[PDB]
Design a binder for this molecule. Structure first.
Ligand code: 4WF
Ligand code: 4WF
Ligand code: 4WF
Ligand code: 4WF
Ligand code: CL
Ligand code: CL
Ligand code: CL
Ligand code: CL
Lengths: 297, 293, 293, 298
């Protein structure tokens, strides 16, 4: 007898194989900076903006200690961070098997460790996805090269009717972004997956499962949002220039976890002041200190 | 006479944290390759094959794992540790036994050079068996560097490290050539007011005896700024623009080794095997069948 | 009336480091099972099935991963976090919604009890549906604890938290029974000179209102705490001596749940299976067939 | 074409102890349990360190690996280079050399079991002898009451080792081979040629017999004045805790304190040791590290 009287996050920050070698031979791409902070800050900030405090980071055995040195156990930012290893990159859906015990009986969210989002009312858009308790939620975004992604086809009335992974002839230009919200059915859906031609457990197959059951919500992420990934050397450079333009224009940072934790009330002024101290001599610590006196709307 | 090389890829403190919290700055990519490929390339272009890499205690394994012992590229690489960021001149104390009685050269691990006939300009400094050679480059913010003053006739007459009031806009770049005197000069150095053993004091020592050759690195050369987030980005975009225009890579050690005949066609083919699926391996395999002038 | 249980498994900072860097303290074993099984068993022996486990943000998920919802043992387990080690009395504020309008019991996570008819001693306190009930135990070092003073007739006349000059050698143990007032009492409390919401301050409130019952836990009971390296070791040896003599286990939740009829023979059988290869699983299997008085 | 200007790499087998110590180990895994005042894994780590070994590979289950990584990091705080590898299945102690193949590379190695603790006078010197011989293998033999539980070494009348048997029901001697092994460059190749035993495992005893049969096994006696303790049962863990507690409380000195060992080895200096003492200053361990900065201990 069970008794019924929340949502957990996962960041997949595993090995990107050899695609970006030699740039990534020495370290994981999710530890590479995007302008002024490690790539992993961005997806972490996305989970935090969704209200998620308990987060599992999945990385290679080789890179886990570096993530741990960077992020700790989360206590400094009002979070709980746990770690798991992915000995070989067997696909995105494997996160749910690796993370089965972490997830337990809760709702979950998966974000890719190399995905960056930017836009207005983003916090509010993540809230509406995270509050929806049943089924699955994903976001669709108009791209130039939909063949690189999971692609969602829509009927005349705007209802999602099919998902295809990396189709040679996409039915739309709407790619599924690297952020996914799941109810308690996901671990059992993943467990029943069998590997694709590439030998991978595909997230698209998980999402198609929900779709066939009429439990997939596909929200359009509009053109006034930037969804960037750091898939090529050129795209990583563009992403850093994009963040630098916005930050240097505004004097506000994108995806500063200390800031977000503070604005969420997960840490207070006294704790924020402490986090600022060791970086007092550089731009980042000086930003954190300013946060304490300034009202930002 | 033999010249040994030293790459100093030490700690940049908290200056670029949290971007460098996880990993030292010289293991970060500039566009498509680890930042250290660029100084290693500079030394290779100067004809230097025996090279010591000095890094933090934490990062030396990450450099050793990246570069190996060098035999795959016709190099002889060794590694050593700088436990504290106590000055660029410490390189010659750390590297004393490595250097032995040979000629030497020091390059900073975050220094990026681009321009015409770099191979020639290095070859001339490397051939000088006595004295020291450095390069001065016109910059906008000379205060950040070793600043060199010249008399009306163009002769180097003074060096100041990070002066409050620069005597010129000519900064000394992070590439130094030295004869057999440099270890003994470094050994007698005392810490500065900042608490560092200064490369500029080494260079002043050579200067007082008229044995410092200060060559001008002209405006037609790129000495790229890697000191800030803003400038690491600019450098990435500079390399990308060159490589995407030309279809030729800047600072590809495999290619350089191949062109200096340090490895043969069968060795370069084996190096391309692992990267075959990506742009870098494709580049290395194309090198074998194309004449580049 | 139903009584709800709270186990406070609070953070012990870095007092037990590096032992507890490996895993937090109420997850460390006392001889052959996790520390938290003992206070859980105490609650279970008082007839309490609905239990809230409060711990740190980092530890609470590990307790959840160990114990789950308790359905396997006929329990109803829930979890809550205490952000900062800001006093034991915060348990009632953190736990306000869980407690609802019911009576409660609080047990500290590092407290171990052993003795004859402990079951019956818990029953007496469990059924007093008004006021609060605590237990006094004669100890050698009363200064470490909440100390209770008695007068000539053995009536409790004062409570003092870790007094420099103890008025008696009776310590109040880490087990507390409370009525419906305790949440409002905790809400009105003003933090102590130490800067922590004290449980002794909750107990003084009840005392001053003439509503605190102090029962003697006699010398034939063992009350141990496992809060230091030394004390954990001594507790391990004590449990080992009892268990190896008797061939019976102290604080086995499965056994207690089975003997309380909260799970049946079929359920206990299933719980034994995964543990079949060790002494604990063979023990649960033995309990299906053996009569133990 | 190679050049010279020898390094020995360490491996710690911190494998999954199955269910044998459940439910104690449901919460935290075996080599993360404390022996008195520090995690079990500190003891075999300290042993490798005392042998002069700085580059160390830790092999554990996928679930345990990040817990070890959270405890120990990359080692750089203690002047070490710690690496990690996963053991998917409990397929024998010899599997360490296949899992650890690329880590070892062309170097000498040492393998230590995660649950072995050693204590005694100039253990440092004893390990030196073994660490220094750059060819063949070296093991240590120790008189025990229950040789049946271990690999057992038989000696002839002149004290030369003549056979090794794995967990024999009828032991030829009371000399068990302890869980610490030194190997030359041949071990990986010897290990690749092994086949599962009747028990279904790649057995270290088979590796050691291969060296013995080539006359390349050194068996040094670890004498009765050394303590070699096993920490793999509830009773034995508790006995090991009591033993360390008695020594530390008598001496005011710690057994198997990695920070202390790296400081005395000159792998980290006084300033770095002071940094490490900082966060732990609230307890006996940080205060102990602090005291080491001012006290001369012979
Ligand atoms: N995107 C974004 C924000 O919206 N905010 C504002 C915010 C965060 C949390 C709670 C209320 C407001 C940031 O501080 N950083 C960000 O990157
Ligand atoms: N700068 C530069 C080169 O000049 N060359 C040509 C070269 C190298 C060595 C000997 C003769 C010619 C490169 O292949 N890569 C380079 O980055
Ligand atoms: N102390 C103790 C017990 O008395 N019992 C027996 C019992 C439990 C519940 C109800 C009736 C009898 C145990 O199984 N474990 C114990 O630690
Ligand atoms: N066994 C043991 C030691 O011998 N030493 C002394 C030592 C270590 C390294 C170099 C010289 C001396 C310890 O500090 N801790 C120990 O556990
Ligand atoms: Cl906005
Ligand atoms: Cl040119
Ligand atoms: Cl009894
Ligand atoms: Cl000794």
């Amino acid at each position: 007898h069970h008794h019924h009287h929340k949502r957990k996050g996962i960041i997949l920050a595993g090995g990107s194989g050899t695609r970006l070698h030699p740039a990534t031979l020495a370290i994981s791409k999710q530890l590479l900076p995007v302008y002024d902070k490690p790539m992993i800050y961005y997806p972490l900030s996305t989970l935090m903006l969704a209200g998620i405090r308990e987060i599992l980071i999945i990385s290679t055995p080789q890179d886990t200690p570096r993530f741990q040195q960077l992020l700790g156990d989360g206590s400094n930012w009002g979070l709980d961070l746990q770690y798991a290893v992915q000995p070989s990159p067997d696909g995105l859906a494997q996160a749910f098997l690796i993370g089965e015990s972490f997830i337990g009986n809760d709702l979950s969210a998966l974000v890719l460790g190399d995905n960056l989002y930017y836009g207005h009312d983003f916090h509010e858009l993540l809230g509406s996805a995270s509050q929806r308790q049943t089924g699955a939620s994903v976001f669709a975004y108009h791209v130039l090269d939909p063949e690189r992604y999971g692609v969602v086809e829509f009927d005349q009335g705007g209802k999602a009717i099919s998902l295809e992974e990396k189709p040679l002839e996409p039915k739309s230009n709407y790619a599924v972004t690297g952020l996914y919200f799941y109810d308690q059915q996901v671990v059992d859906i993943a467990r029943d997956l069998k590997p694709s031609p590439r030998g991978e457990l595909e997230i698209t197959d998980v999402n198609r499962a929900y779709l066939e059951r009429g439990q997939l919500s596909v929200e359009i992420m509009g053109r006034g949002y930037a969804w960037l990934d750091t898939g090529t050397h050129d795209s990583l450079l563009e992403a850093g220039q994009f963040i630098a333009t916005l930050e240097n224009r505004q004097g506000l940072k994108v995806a500063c976890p200390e800031e977000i934790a503070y604005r969420q009330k997960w840490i207070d002024a006294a704790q924020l002041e402490k986090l600022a101290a060791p970086l007092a001599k550089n731009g980042y610590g000086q930003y954190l200190k300013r946060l304490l006196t300034e009202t930002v709307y």
